[PDB]
């Protein structure tokens, strides 16, 4: 009864490159926040035991895992061919000190989930990992390391069912390739389908197997804001628990869903944002809540911190502490953010049509022979 | 000169065109009935008319040219770019095997379809060699169940970067 | 000796396509009926399988269930 | 209005055939009788008893009332579904007898007390009070009964906190009637292929269900995708579309079921599915077990796409203003993550000398260390040391550190510290120009339409697209309404507020006063007689009142005016006639009383907008706090927000502000949530451009003063304008006004573009009415009591000689009552 | 140089040549080698079957080309070309603004669904292959975004989404089937004034007073229900409820949510099936 909170300070000092969007830094931020609004206290905080090289490859083929071992930004020309293959080099680029960054995500998940495992924490937080695009065997899109479908897993041992939740603006398609043909894991996700990132996420991708009709994907428009996400989230999830009935959920809280992000195109905000959680928190069900996205370090910082302080149990005043970051967050030094006035293109048809027809396929199971 | 193709031939030959171009599919070149098993069950089919021996020696004389032909024209001029890679793999998993002892009747056929235009450099040769082409078209398309494949592999996901994808 | 599966496109008159849908139609309405017919009156045995077979939509499933439901209970 | 009347019969059919239970029913109605409150309260008089709508403020609130509470009008479309009711009480009872189980008494009384109100014998307030009284430990079981009650089901397309739905949805296809087309339209062998031709009119639209029809006989589809992809064939008339239901004896409760799996696919994956080869699908992964290789998906990979924007994250562009708080965000990044990696390596080699120093002083001189000395992060100390000491002479530096840590230990603490001083200073005094910049840009990022809507509005004013919008929504009615349509008012403007209905005037003629120092013998005769000719006005307090423009008192003081008590009076009350010249002003004219109304209601929420930029304390240690109320130039004095920014237009307009002071001053106070006040002057720009179109052009002067001058008589205006054809070049629109309602209405009529028309009869003849409608009145009841009517007569053209060639035999004879 | 392959014309590492000067990929080039020659590489610059086999071993000396295919067979069928590095592309296919509302031709712009235009949601589609016109939003896939303006679109309302692949000579005829039933195929088939004025008022007039009548007694059927309508429509879910929690296995809707349950928690048949409350600890 006290959500376990999973922190290893050495995290925030490692860099990707020049201008790349991806800043650890930002879960040092919110940690900042966290230690002087005086939550650490009230939450249950824990260093995680890195992950060592065999349990990345219960997911990861062995020459890859091998690979990240043992490659570095000097001697990069002894792995030069091994750098197309593996698709690390130019946009997951090699950068000192990358094997001890996968193992602090992936350690921390994985302590999240054996946390949950016994009778300890109900809610078991963990920002530094929500890496969703990694493929079992090749790196995509700023993620190496799959650490939600080694969380999955160990989850997979005390529970028949467990769900997936992913709010990124990108289709987490690593998590749902990993559990395309399995009844055991469905992976739920709101994302923008058009000629954005991942490419795919269709509505029609589906399942396969005996996992057929438990893949769920949610393909929006731009610049949806805070009610209209409100309006095709809450029946979408309120649906998957009557049919399906988890017993866990993993709920993947990225944050370029948000208003005024480098890299995403919605337009949420921060209680836009949070009545997902605060929705998904209500259920009683064993959540573990991880990171994700999110590349304006300034929102994400503020976001996370809101979020935490909300699984806790706590509330937070709506003005900054005094910090080690506090000149970051601009005029008015205020806990929100808010919402530009950018057009919405989800008419009400194009929502009630993909939503409607979620609903049918969620409710083929007892409505077939 | 020109010879004449079964439009079933035809129809095969632009299936695979464009399922190598353009869909990124492979045919699995370790060969079950390869280039050198297809070129005896011919004879062993064929010399049944053998009557006349100048015949006979024509036509050894042209089986075996063919096949050691067919082995100097697998890595210049019957492979697509997107066959390039898939090439070296095996040129180096196998590495002093003779070309006609993997490849199969794929791309053999792509050998016979394209000679009126290798042929322009003639008495009589070149009609007993046409005749030949077109009996060997006809008689592998008799038997599509022992010279031709049931699928085109999909071409592999680290494959597709190593030739320009 | 093999040859093309489609070799050239076929003019075809409406009408005698219009009656060849009527009479394919008619023959399949008429197996569905008798389908219909024969599952209205099944049995759906009473202790059978749990988690069963038919569709949600079966006249007789409510009686199965029934008679299984009132066995487990006391 | 056909649309609304149609929409109203509609609901009330499907409420008849069973589609929408009485909750549909009551919020379709809700949503399509708004705006007539006095058809709400006609139709509370045939409600049950408890079930009424609750108006007030003259139909600004209203909340259908109930047996237990009230429900306020929230809308989505919600239907029912059984399966999630009964979901949702199996969970409730579950619950609810897991609480009571240490007395299995007090769920019996939940038993046999349910039980009694199935039958009669109790009611909502008196099941509810023993409820109530059960559930009063248990404040969370208690608060979900409440979803089993009359009140949450009326709009209930939203979940509560820890519940399954409470309704079902599906799609509505832009009906003002919230009712799916699936449930509508569908709920002889010479009747069905007879019709079709008719239908399907288009003679490759018919060919094209002829091929469908043709491939499911020879065997290549089954009945589902014949019937579900011939939906969006023949399903716009609900008696083809129900017969070929039973053609194929399909009943409709199935046709749902299958519509939606069956018109389409690659399916049993979807798109991006590709199947491994066999040979990949053993790549090995050395510490999975039995159960994760048989979880795990082998089979089938998806991957990274390009429809043009997919390999890579690189997404489109952005205001000027982003690029400059990105850019200021990376500043301070860089010389953070420097600082506090440095500050990380300091500590951790602190901890590590205060564990070579605490040992006996004779080990201590050789107490060796490994390469990266234990830390498990090796990388972070590697590169601090790197920059800090000239990569090129790391290398010794890492060696010493290896072999003798105590004598290099503090000596390089020290150097660290040093070089860290020197970094937090550098970064101090920058400090300074990072806020300056991030106060000029924070702003703008929140407010994106500041670039994109001087634009899109640009395209909004035009000519052409106004012109063009009354053609197609006069095309549009001429098809779902083929009868009904000739009543069609293709837009109802309603100008029910008159203090805004002055200050657009105001507006337009205050700006034409000062711009143009030309007209105003009669940009004011437009505004004082050909306004109220149309609009329905005073005409003497609104030309008293509006003479505080053209005289002056402006520019000095510069007020908000004094306004007119009661500027409107109390079937059609006034119809004129005019071209698209007078249309465009009429379309204009509406935009910015829009604009004014929407301004005049943002300023409730006024309040909550200056409570985000309140003072926070700690900010208060001398950092910025850079209040926004000093860039404000002098705010008006008058007594709410809606005339101050009046007097910030009428500024604007003068010339006494530009843009960028009075943007900064709109968002000072709305947020970013006025941002279609940012282009209010090109839009009287536009107004104050056609004002003096109708005056001038030497084309449309005569068209104005014939009205003008026959307005002193109604017979007059519609025979001249519609019976005897001056026609210039254009459209013709007839505007209306309604004044019980204050309701205006434009109505395309004519053309303008073949004409050497005299006329066949003598217009003092027919000398009867008032109106045109009414014309058209008399006519249909001389017709229906008619005493003879017969159309016997019939013609031909003749080809390539555009003559009548009437075949003989054929009469026609009319005779009037009156006659015998 | 050139800076495209000799043999495939594409970009990328090219191995170029010195004397002769090309470009080759080095795995498109002579044997492929694998890379990596940084040295000359002078890429070959230098009548019976026994003349054709001469002519066998002449080969040899000319620069390896990329394979096509002959004129005659790669332009045989209907719609298939090559495109300019020798791929098979399809002619058929090639050659948006989102608000459109009058076409060229004059005539309304009006979706084929709804019948509304493209100012109910912000943009209409317009079929290549027909003369119909779509909301995004109304097909049942629904469009996220709109297609590329240099391939064509094609509307619902076609059967060439349900005939497989057949690819036709180019230069077939039709042929005009004279077969009166029966016919097999698999889709590769085509197909074979009063000047009343007066009587259209009355006509008018006289239809509108029959809808009038007609919606006036449909809702003098309807309204006089509303009593029972609101009753039962209103208090069902607590008759559910107390159907429910007295446990009435006869409501046959509730064991056919008893057996959703049991299809949830994937019932082994072997086990017996629990009570009826015993079941409901699957949701609590
Ligand atoms: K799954
Ligand atoms: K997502
Ligand atoms: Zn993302
Ligand atoms: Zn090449
Ligand atoms: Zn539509
Ligand atoms: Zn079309």
Redesign the pocket.
Same mark, same amino acid.
Do not use: I
């Given at each position: 009864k006290k959500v376990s909170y999973f922190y290893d300070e050495d995290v925030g000092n490692y860099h990707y490159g020049p201008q790349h969007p991806m800043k650890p830094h930002r879960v040092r931020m919110v940690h900042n926040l966290v230690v002087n609004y005086n939550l650490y206290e009230k939450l249950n905080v824990i260093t995680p035991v890195r992950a060592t090289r065999n349990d990345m490859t219960r997911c990861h083929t062995d020459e890859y895992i091998e690979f990240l071992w043992r490659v570095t930004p000097d001697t990069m020309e002894k792995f030069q061919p091994h750098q197309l293959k593996f698709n690390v080099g130019d946009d997951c680029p090699v950068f000192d000190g990358l094997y001890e960054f996968c193992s602090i995500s992936a350690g921390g998940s994985i302590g999240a989930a054996q946390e949950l495992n016994s009778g300890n924490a109900e809610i078991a937080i963990n920002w530094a990992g929500g890496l969703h695009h990694a493929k079992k065997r090749e790196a995509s899109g700023f993620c190496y390391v799959n650490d939600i479908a080694l969380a999955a897993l160990e989850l997979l041992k005390y529970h028949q069912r467990v769900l997936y939740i992913d709010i990124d603006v990108h289709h987490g398609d690593g998590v749902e390739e990993f559990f395309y043909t399995t009844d055991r894991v469905m992976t739920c996700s709101f994302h923008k389908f058009g000629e954005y990132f991942p490419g795919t996420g269709h509505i029609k991708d589906t399942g396969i197997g005996t996992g057929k009709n438990y893949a769920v994907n949610v393909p929006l428009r731009d610049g949806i804001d805070d009610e209209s996400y409100e309006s095709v989230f809450k029946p979408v999830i309120s649906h998957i628990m009557q049919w399906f009935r988890p017993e866990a959920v993993i709920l993947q809280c990225g944050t370029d869903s948000l208003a005024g992000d480098r890299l995403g195109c919605f337009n949420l905000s921060m209680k836009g944002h949070s009545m997902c959680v605060d929705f998904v928190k209500s259920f009683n069900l064993p959540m573990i809540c991880v990171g994700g996205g999110g590349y304006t370090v300034r929102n994400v910082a503020r976001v996370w911190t809101y979020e935490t302080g909300l699984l806790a149990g706590e509330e937070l005043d709506e003005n900054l502490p005094y910090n080690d970051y506090l000149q970051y967050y601009g005029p008015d030094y205020k806990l929100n953010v808010l919402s530009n006035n950018m057009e919405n293109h989800n008419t009400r048809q194009y929502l009630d049509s993909i939503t409607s027809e979620i609903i049918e396929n969620l409710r083929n199971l007892s409505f077939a022979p | 000169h020109k010879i004449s193709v079964p439009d079933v031939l035809k129809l095969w030959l632009v299936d695979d065109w464009e399922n190598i171009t353009k869909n990124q599919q492979l045919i699995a070149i370790p060969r079950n009935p390869t280039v050198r098993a297809a070129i005896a069950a011919f004879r062993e089919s064929k010399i049944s008319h053998l009557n006349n021996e100048i015949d006979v020696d024509v036509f050894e004389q042209a089986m075996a040219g063919l096949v050691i032909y067919f082995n100097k024209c697998l890595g210049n001029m019957l492979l697509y770019?997107f066959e390039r890679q898939q090439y070296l793999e095996i040129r180096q998993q196998y590495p002093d095997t003779e070309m006609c002892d993997l490849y199969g009747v794929e791309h053999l056929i792509r050998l016979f379809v394209s000679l009126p235009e290798l042929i322009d450099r003639d008495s009589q040769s070149i009609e007993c060699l046409l005749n030949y082409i077109e009996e060997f078209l006809k008689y592998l398309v008799l038997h599509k169940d022992e010279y031709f494949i049931k699928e085109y592999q999909n071409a592999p996901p680290n494959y597709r970067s190593l030739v320009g994808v | 000796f093999p040859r093309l599966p489609v070799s050239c496109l076929y003019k075809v008159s409406e009408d005698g396509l219009i009656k060849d849908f009527l009479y394919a139609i008619g023959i399949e309405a008429k197996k569905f009926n008798n389908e219909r017919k024969k599952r209205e009156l099944e049995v759906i045995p009473p202790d059978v399988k749990s988690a069963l077979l038919p569709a949600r939509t079966h006249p007789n499933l409510p009686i199965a269930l029934r008679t299984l439901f009132n066995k487990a209970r006391t | 209005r056909p649309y609304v009347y149609s929409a109203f019969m509609d609901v009330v059919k499907a409420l008849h055939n069973e589609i929408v239970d009485f909750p549909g029913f009551i919020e379709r109605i809700s949503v399509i009788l708004r705006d007539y409150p006095d058809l709400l309260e006609y139709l509370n008089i045939f409600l049950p008893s408890s079930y009424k709508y609750l108006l007030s403020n003259s139909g600004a609130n209203f909340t259908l009332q109930f047996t237990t509470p009230s429900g306020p009008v929230s809308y989505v479309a919600t239907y029912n579904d059984l399966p999630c009711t009964y979901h949702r009480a199996i969970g409730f009872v579950s619950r609810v007898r897991r609480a009571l189980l240490s007395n299995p008494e007090q769920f019996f009384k939940l038993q046999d007390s349910l039980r009694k109100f199935k039958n009669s014998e109790c009611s909502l307030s008196e099941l509810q009070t023993i409820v109530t009284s059960l559930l009063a430990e248990h404040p969370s079981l208690a608060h979900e009964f409440h979803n089993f009650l009359p009140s949450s089901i009326f709009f209930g397309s939203k979940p509560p906190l820890g519940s399954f739905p409470l309704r079902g949805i599906q799609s509505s296809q832009f009906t003002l009637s919230n009712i799916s087309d699936l449930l509508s339209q569908s709920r002889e062998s010479s009747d069905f292929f007879k019709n079709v031709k008719n239908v399907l009119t288009d003679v490759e639209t018919y060919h094209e269900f002829l091929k469908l029809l043709n491939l499911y006989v020879q065997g290549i589809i089954d009945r589902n995708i014949l019937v579900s992809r011939g939906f969006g064939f023949l399903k716009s008339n609900s008696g083809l579309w129900r017969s070929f239901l039973s053609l194929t004896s399909l009943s409709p409760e199935e046709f749902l079921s299958v519509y939606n799996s069956a018109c389409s696919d690659f399916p049993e994956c979807g798109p991006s599915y590709r199947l491994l080869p066999v040979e990949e699908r053993n790549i090995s992964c050395s510490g999975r077990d039995d159960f994760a290789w048989g979880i795990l998906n082998d089979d089938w990979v998806s991957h990274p796409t390009w429809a043009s924007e997919e390999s890579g994250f690189i997404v489109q562009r952005k205001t000027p203003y982003e690029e400059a708080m990105t850019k200021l965000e990376e500043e301070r990044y860089e010389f953070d993550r420097h600082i506090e990696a440095t500050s990380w390596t300091i500590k951790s080699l602190k901890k590590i000398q205060n564990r070579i120093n605490e040992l006996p002083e004779e080990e201590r001189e050789t107490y060796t260390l490994e390469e990266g000395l234990g830390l498990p992060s090796k990388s972070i100390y590697k590169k601090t040391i790197k920059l800090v000491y000239t990569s090129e002479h790391a290398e010794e530096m890492f060696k010493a550190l290896e072999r003798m840590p105590c004598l290099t230990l503090p000596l390089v603490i020290s150097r660290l510290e040093e070089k860290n001083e020197e970094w937090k200073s550098v970064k101090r005094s920058l400090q300074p120009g990072w806020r300056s910049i991030e106060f000029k840009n924070y702003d703008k990022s929140l407010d994106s339409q500041c670039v994109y809507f001087k634009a899109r509005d640009k395209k909004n004013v035009s000519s052409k697209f106004l012109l063009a919008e009354a053609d197609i929504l006069r095309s549009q009615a001429k098809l779902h309404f083929p009868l009904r349509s000739r009543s069609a008012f293709e837009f109802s403007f309603v100008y029910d507020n008159e203090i805004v209905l002055f200050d657009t005037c105001y507006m337009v003629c205050t700006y034409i006063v000062c711009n143009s120092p030309s007209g105003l013998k009669k940009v004011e005769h437009f505004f004082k007689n050909i306004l109220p000719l149309h609009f329905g006005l005073e005409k003497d307090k609104f030309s008293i009142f509006l003479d505080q423009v053209f005289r002056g008192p402006i520019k000095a003081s510069l007020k908000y005016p004094s306004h007119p008590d009661s500027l409107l009076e109390h079937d059609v009350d006034k119809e004129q006639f005019g071209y698209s010249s007078m249309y465009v002003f009429f379309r204009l004219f509406n935009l910015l009383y829009e604009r004014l109304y929407e301004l005049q209601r943002l300023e409730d929420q006024v309040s909550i907008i200056q409570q985000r930029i309140i003072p926070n304390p700690v900010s208060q240690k001398q950092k910025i706090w850079r209040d926004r109320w000093n860039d404000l130039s002098d705010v008006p004095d008058e007594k709410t927000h809606y005339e101050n920014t009046y007097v910030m237009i009428l500024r604007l307009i003068y010339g006494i502000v530009d843009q960028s002071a009075f943007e900064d001053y709109l968002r000072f106070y709305y947020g970013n949530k006025a941002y279609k006040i940012y282009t209010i002057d090109k839009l009287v720009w536009s107004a104050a451009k056609q004002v003096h179109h109708i005056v001038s052009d030497g084309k449309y002067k005569f068209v104005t003063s014939l009205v003008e001058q026959n307005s002193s008589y109604d017979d007059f205006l519609y025979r001249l304008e519609i019976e005897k054809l001056l026609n210039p070049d254009e459209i013709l629109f007839r505007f209306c006004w309604i004044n019980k309602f204050k309701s205006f209405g434009i109505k395309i009529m004519k053309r303008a573009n073949y004409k050497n028309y005299r006329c066949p009869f003598l217009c003092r003849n027919i000398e009867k009415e008032r109106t045109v409608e009414q014309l058209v009145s008399r006519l249909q009841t001389k017709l229906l009591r008619s005493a003879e009517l017969v159309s016997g007569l019939q013609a031909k053209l003749c080809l390539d000689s555009f003559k009548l060639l009437y075949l003989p035999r054929t009469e026609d004879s009319y005779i009037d009552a009156s006659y015998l | 140089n050139n800076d495209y &392959?000799s043999? &495939?014309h594409?970009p990328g590492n090219f191995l170029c040549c010195e004397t002769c000067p090309n470009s080759?990929?080095f795995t &498109?080039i002579d044997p492929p080698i694998e890379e990596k020659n940084l040295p000359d590489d002078a890429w070959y610059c230098n009548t019976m079957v026994d003349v054709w086999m001469q002519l066998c071993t002449y080969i040899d000396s000319h620069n390896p080309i990329q394979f096509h295919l002959p004129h005659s067979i790669s332009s045989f069928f209907r719609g298939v070309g090559s495109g300019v590095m020798g791929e098979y592309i399809e002619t058929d296919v090639l050659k948006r603004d989102p608000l459109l509302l009058k076409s060229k031709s004059g005539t309304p712009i009006l979706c084929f669904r709804c019948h509304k235009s493209a100012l109910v949601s912000q943009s209409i589609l317009a079929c290549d292959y027909c003369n119909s016109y779509w909301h995004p939003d109304c097909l049942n896939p629904p469009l996220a975004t709109l297609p590329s303006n240099l391939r064509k679109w094609k509307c619902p309302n076609h059967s060439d989404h349900v005939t497989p692949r057949y690819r036709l000579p180019e230069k077939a005829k039709v042929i005009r089937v004279g077969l009166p039933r029966g016919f097999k195929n698999k889709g590769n088939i085509v197909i074979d004034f009063k000047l009343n004025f007066l009587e259209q008022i009355r006509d008018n007039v006289i239809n509108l007073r029959k809808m009038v009548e007609q919606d006036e007694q449909l809702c003098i059927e309807t309204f006089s229900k509303f009593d029972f309508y609101a009753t039962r429509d209103c208090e069902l879910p607590l008759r559910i409820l107390c159907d429910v929690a007295n446990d009435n296995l006869e409501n046959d809707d509730y064991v056919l949510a008893l057996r959703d349950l049991l299809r949830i928690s994937k019932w082994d048949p072997n086990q017996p099936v629990p009570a009826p409350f015993d079941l409901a600890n699957l949701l609590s």
């Open positions: - | 770019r | - | - | &392959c043999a &495939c594409g080759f990929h &498109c």
